[PDB]
Symmetry: D2
Subunit: 340 residues, 4 copies
């Protein structure tokens, strides 16, 4: 039949997932919707046709006619919400990060384990991106030999700095590497099958020095050594002049590849007095639209066919963990072991 | 609130539209199907859950519980099936070209006129393509000035040679200019708002002699002059070694642009002993997947909203007319006025 | 040893060649020079080290210690100046076109053949271009199979429009197709080994109203059929907004190539709010600096080795002839046979 | 007048410098050559017309008829050869790196200062590269704002692996960082005007067993922090499957640029069954041919015109200083300070 879904969270990404499930995802019905903001639930109802609205997640979980939940609430809320819906026997989708505190994660990683009758999936959608999957297949086919180095760039567009400042001046966290680099960590683990041993990170505020006063970072770089001495390089950022730069390079013994060497918007190339111009993708909903739909449909399908997707809490744990180590290494300006 | 659709044709493109309608197109349901190949209908029943199968189009429109038809039969059958379905009070989507005979088209267009309450939409899917649309927007905003020249390439992949030969020998395709270049003719018309005045076409078979034996042209080239002296160049063919080469260049007074200068498959760049490699899109279902989906949903949405899409019988007529002039100019090896 | 060379003509291109021979050309020596200028030669005199100034090739070729001339005088003067030096017993380099009147050209062709001890070289410099040569080697190696179509663009930069008008309004030379398209004709003959049978050309002025006033063509396009039904497409123009667009595409039975698909200036890529930008080459001395140098040196080496370069009067003849055929097809707006 | 030049070293690069000097460089003559390989000196006599040959450097500088020397001997021999040539009254060009020991360089630095009337130029040829100069121009013109990060890759071709092993096993190279990464260090300094504060470097051998045997690193990666907190990333290696990968990326407050994002060979694009192919430059002689010529002529002109080029022992010392730090960091696998 049709998988009834109650979503929690209708911010930036909530609205995308909401809209997709409602209108694009087959075998799916967006039945419930939770938010502490009434306007969103009114948008939910008088735009997507949502039936049961709530202001408390558990309220949604106990009374709603749903089989599964999409957790698109802020990070600090994920772990209790995952435990809570599993306890109510819901299948669970949670956005990244899985959570912030390791202990809690380790704890939730068993609740999920003890509910092996329920599907759990984490929102590392890059795993579903056609381009990443294309490369992943090349690597698995042995087309570049053995991986020696991965470089991954995740830089937010400068058009977003305005609202990042202001926000940064009103609130804090989760930090540059926990916001931007955790997808890269997962991409690194996915491709190599290895784990990260130690990291060093540096950072710089140069476009907007005021970020020094707000305890935030505009640009960051890191070097990592994996457990098998495979090398990794990261850049994270918030000030990309050209758009949304997410690029992943993989160097091997027999070749080399790059996924979005440049963030090509489409098949159009423009020529004018500037020279040869290629328009670019501008933000994550644009760049990763396809990936979001594919992860959404994967979840549903994993429930109907009783099949594991393969993105586990362990992947969530190690993501958050390595992210934290980058942050710590930045603060200390020194090398940090991930296991500590 | 839900459109039951009957499709005729389940071949190279028929199987795509069907699959799309049954599984991805909202407020639509693939209710019926028609094909002269029994294995295909078996496939519709089993894999797509299609209710009603027929081997006669006239039979489907009379007896199926449908609200609309998708015409994906070979080109020589289009006009008969449009009129029939119209006369049966069903909404009509027809693939290109609209027909192969001008006289018959004119007649069909007047039948469409009597039924000014039924929707008619032609399958010039390029108008729905994200990249083409983007370029259109650019041109509309004045980014390249006024158009001076359009060059358009539409070249089928060498790897599809066998499947083409089967298509080409199972029914009249109308030839290279009517089967391929008609997309380009429509693009030129879409972009300039002008009509083609006179043309000269040349051709050549050099790679695949089997095409001659099927009376099909392997590679064609043409020069066209529009009514306002806007210039245009076309190339069509059946032998692109690298994949599906569909490219449109628009030259203007203040710049120029190219749509799929090269048929980039994705965001993956590969580097090895051959050099820098970009994988390519391989065929129309891959390249134009999005477009096909968009035109399908636009067709369906037009029925529910009672508003026209703008791809008209007149666009079909004028396309076919120019295509026939290219064919004629090819046969005569001389300039031909579209007026004749 | 050292080849002693005298040059006639020292304007836009003349100053390039002379400056090259003096300073970068090996086993060669600039000695003589001639022009309608005391000036420009006033320039030549001082910071080139030009000893001898004249106003008559004949006057100039009379007293000088040289083995050879290098003809960079205007079109009309080539031939008469060609025979004179051969009448003087010198080896000869001349620029394109070889001349402008067919019967005249056919005459000189008889002469050159009668001085089978002397070197005659024509300045189709694209033959010495590293990129053109690379493509030629690929084609000759069978990498693309047999050539079915060649498309060639030669569009001058819009930034050069005022200097063009200045140049043109005061001294005609010699039409668009004859000025721009002749290199492309020569490239087509070079790669194919074939000759052009019939052509049709059209044209448009839309961007720069001064060209109307000057009686010049802004953009032209042409289709050509070669003697073996090999296809060819040409565009020439004066309004390339992005730079100097000289591109040549070669489609074959097993592949296709593009020489300067876009005119990349260097290895630098720029990324900003416009998107991804490739700076471009701006004019012919930039783009073909290497070619010009290589043709100068080949000529010299040709003397020293007594070995013929292979760019003949016949290549000159067929170039002007095809260019004249294009010009006539533009004027008449009909197909023209090259043999007329 | 003519600068009589004597060269030491006729290996991988020495044969190129020699050939250029004798055949391409104005106002210069390759009078003398020194090498520990007799077959090499013959080749100079037979092929380049070198009058005086030697097996010992001191020998050449005492007894040859020269004004200046090019030092292209292995790196551990540079400093003693610079000093010896200076004492003998000769101008000096030395290849990179200037030396391998800091105290020695400081001493050689003081010797250069005592002969301030003689020219000293170090062979950081990238400073002369047209594409690097263009990027430097853009940066100086504010086109990308202030520099936040430089990533630089220098990865030798896998095809050159045999020639490398000969080079590395015949004399001490100094390791990957002193031999390769030093170019990038200089670029970072040239662009930023700042010095490197601290580094961490890691490394891996995975493809070619000979390298470990020869005590060489196959691929290295490094994070550096400069004195003003400007970030830097390095990768160097000996196993690039696609060609010679020398790439330099500059990230800024207002934009970003890439020098040789990929090492495009020329203007030719190839299209076939593998997709879209760009051929690549294969090795240093190819990629930096122009640079090498420019620095040679710059050296020679500096002697004739008595104007300093501006690439100094201090540039040498600061580069060797940072490279050693990288080496130590690699060996210890921990952060190192350049000062201490
Ligand atoms: N997959 C990806 O690439 C990305 C994932 N994320 C993850 O997004 C989650 C959503 O982020 P945003 O939409 O940007 O945040 P947000 O602030 O934009 O929206 C949060 C949603 O929070 C709901 N919410 C807040 N407190 C709640 C509560 N106590 N109970 C129920 N709902 C509550 C808000 O009302 C709203 O419904 C985070 O895990 C974020 O990191 C965000 C961006 C990208
Ligand atoms: N928009 C586009 O890019 C494309 C459009 N097309 C158009 O789609 C149409 C279908 O082409 P393909 O699918 O390649 O052809 P095909 O040869 O693969 O399939 C034809 C289908 O029509 C059926 N058919 C044949 N004669 C029939 C009749 N008298 N009554 C009912 N059904 C009949 C066959 O059973 C088969 O199912 C053509 O007009 C073609 O021009 C095709 C490919 C791409
Ligand atoms: N190979 C190529 O791609 C190119 C070839 N050319 C050709 O090179 C030649 C020079 O063209 P431009 O430099 O553009 O011309 P220009 O406009 O610079 O004039 C060139 C020179 O011709 C001289 N001249 C004019 N009338 C003369 C006369 N009666 N006797 C002696 N000298 C006279 C002028 O003094 C001037 O010094 C032409 O044949 C031109 O078509 C030009 C551009 C590119
Ligand atoms: N700027 C650049 O991009 C490049 C710089 N280099 C630098 O140039 C230098 C030469 O490297 P390669 O030519 O690759 O080395 P190589 O090993 O290919 O050539 C060495 C040459 O030096 C001679 N030689 C060795 N020991 C000698 C001694 N004690 N006295 C006199 N001659 C001696 C050998 O006979 C041979 O002719 C190195 O310092 C290297 O770092 C090398 C290649 C590229
Ligand atoms: O029918 C033709 C269609 O118009 C094209 O888009 C497609 O590429 C061809 O294969 C079809 O024959
Ligand atoms: O003489 C023309 C030359 O052939 C072209 O290449 C160039 O672009 C034009 O400026 C010249 O007029
Ligand atoms: O000495 C190294 C030089 O600096 C590089 O440019 C070259 O690529 C290497 O092969 C050399 O060893």
């Amino acid at each position: 039949k049709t998988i009834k879904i109650g979503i929690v969270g209708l911010g930036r990404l909530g609205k995308i997932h909401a809209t997709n499930i409602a209108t694009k995802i087959q075998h799916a019905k967006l039945q419930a919707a939770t938010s502490v903001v009434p306007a969103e639930l009114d948008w939910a109802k008088k735009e997507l046709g949502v039936e049961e609205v709530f202001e408390d997640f558990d309220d949604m979980v106990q009374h709603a006619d749903i089989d599964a939940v999409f957790i698109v609430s802020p990070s600090g809320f994920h772990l209790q919400q995952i435990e809570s819906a599993l306890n109510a026997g819901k299948h669970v989708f949670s956005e990244k990060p899985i959570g912030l505190d390791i202990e809690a994660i380790e704890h939730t990683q068993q609740v999920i384990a003890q509910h092996a009758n329920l599907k759990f999936q984490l929102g590392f959608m890059r795993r579903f991106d056609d381009s990443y999957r294309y490369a992943k297949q090349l690597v698995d086919q042995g087309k570049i030999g053995d991986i020696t180095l991965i470089r991954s760039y995740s830089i937010d567009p400068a058009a977003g700095m305005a609202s990042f400042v202001k926000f940064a001046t009103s609130a804090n966290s989760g930090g540059l590497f926990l916001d931007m680099s955790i997808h890269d960590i997962d991409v690194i683990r996915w491709f190599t099958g290895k784990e990260i041993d130690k990291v060093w990170a540096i950072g710089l505020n140069r476009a907007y020095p005021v970020l020094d006063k707000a305890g935030e970072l505009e640009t960051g770089a890191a070097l990592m050594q994996l457990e098998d001495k495979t090398m990794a390089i990261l850049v994270a950022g918030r000030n990309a002049a050209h758009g949304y730069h997410v690029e992943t390079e993989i160097i091997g013994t027999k070749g080399m590849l790059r996924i979005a060497q440049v963030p090509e918007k489409n098949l159009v190339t423009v020529m004018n007095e500037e020279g040869i111009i290629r328009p670019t993708s501008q933000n994550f909903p644009e760049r990763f639209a396809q990936a979001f739909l594919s992860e959404e449909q994967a979840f549903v399908n994993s429930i109907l066919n009783n099949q594991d997707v393969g993105i586990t809490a362990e992947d969530g744990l190690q993501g958050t963990k390595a992210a934290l180590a980058l942050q710590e290494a930045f603060e200390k300006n020194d090398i940090v072991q991930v296991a500590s």
